[PDB]
Amino acid sequence: MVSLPRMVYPQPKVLTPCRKDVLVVTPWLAPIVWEGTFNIDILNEQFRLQNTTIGLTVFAIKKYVAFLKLFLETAEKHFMVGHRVHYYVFTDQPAAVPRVTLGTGRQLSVLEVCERRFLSEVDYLVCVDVDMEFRDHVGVEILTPLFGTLHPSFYGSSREAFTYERRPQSQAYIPKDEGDFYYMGAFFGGSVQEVQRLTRACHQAMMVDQANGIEAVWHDESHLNKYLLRHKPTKVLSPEYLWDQQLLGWPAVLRKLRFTAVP
Numbered sequence: 001m002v003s004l005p006r007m008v009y010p011q012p013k014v015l016t017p018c019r020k021d022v023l024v025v026t027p028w029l030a031p032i033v034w035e036g037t038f039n040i041d042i043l044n045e046q047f048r049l050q051n052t053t054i055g056l057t058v059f060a061i062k063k064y065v066a067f068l069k070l071f072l073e074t075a076e077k078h079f080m081v082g083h084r085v086h087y088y089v090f091t092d093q094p095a096a097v098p099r100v101t102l103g104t105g106r107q108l109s110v111l112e113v114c115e116r117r118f119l120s121e122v123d124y125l126v127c128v129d130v131d132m133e134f135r136d137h138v139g140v141e142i143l144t145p146l147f148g149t150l151h152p153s154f155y156g157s158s159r160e161a162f163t164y165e166r167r168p169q170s171q172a173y174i175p176k177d178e179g180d181f182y183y184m185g186a187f188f189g190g191s192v193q194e195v196q197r198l199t200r201a202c203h204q205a206m207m208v209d210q211a212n213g214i215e216a217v218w219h220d221e222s223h224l225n226k227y228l229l230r231h232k233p234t235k236v237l238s239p240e241y242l243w244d245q246q247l248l249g250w251p252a253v254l255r256k257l258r259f260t261a262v263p
């Protein structure tokens, strides 16, 4: 909206790609976010000028409350640092939420287990699993109306290998000749409006499956994939954003490991 200030940085080279080893844009022209494809200083300026507020939602029920301390502590070091952040922790154990020290402009709300609240408190919603930890920068480069993240086990696989729901009787059904990528349900987001549209669509699809006595092979994630196939995400995050170094190591194609599973 408002003009950017004078900035000094390397000139982009039209005849020189940032990454030649990976696909950096989808066939529907959505950027695929990899290290080396973005100048974070320009993006930080753009989003700060809009006073962007990012909501980060996590569910922590039963034994999963034990993962909150590390999750939040590392989020404080790597997630949207410099921007307004509102954590939303949905849990069945409010008193079990650890007291983590937050940086300025960041807040945390504990919700024991309306959506209109999100529309009035944040601009973007980022939905992730709690048994994870941030190990490197996860910032505004991910913000867009709707984004999904490439599952680390299938980013180099053929669509036939994708573990989509293959039974026509399920609303999440995707035939062998269809599919762009296999997105992991552990990290997705977008504007509040788009995220709520996705969740409402997923919820209705799962209810229909329940009525027909069928459960998608990978539950919510199967429906997430059906939704993103029919409603293309405006940005796709590379596996840098969802990794497990113990199970997958550290491939050369991954310059940074940003958000990983906890052993």
Ligand SMILES: CCCCCCCCO[C@@H]1O[C@H](CO)[C@H](O)[C@H](N)[C@H]1O[C@@H]1O[C@@H](C)[C@@H](O)[C@@H](O)[C@@H]1O
Residues within 6 Å of the ligand: 151, 152, 153, 163, 184, 185, 186, 218, 221, 242, 243, 244, 247, 260, 261
């Ligand atoms: C963010 C690190 C994930 C690394 C990948 C491990 C491979 C098994 O992943 C499972 O993949 C299926 C799809 O085929 C579903 O996406 C499952 N939800 C995935 O399970 C995850 O990973 C396993 C190892 C375990 O930690 C589960 O709790 C977790 O949900």
Ligand SMILES: [Hg+2]
Residues within 6 Å of the ligand: 057, 125, 126, 127, 195
């Ligand atoms: Hg969410």
Ligand SMILES: [Hg+2]
Residues within 6 Å of the ligand: 198, 199, 202, 203, 220, 221, 223, 224
């Ligand atoms: Hg979903």
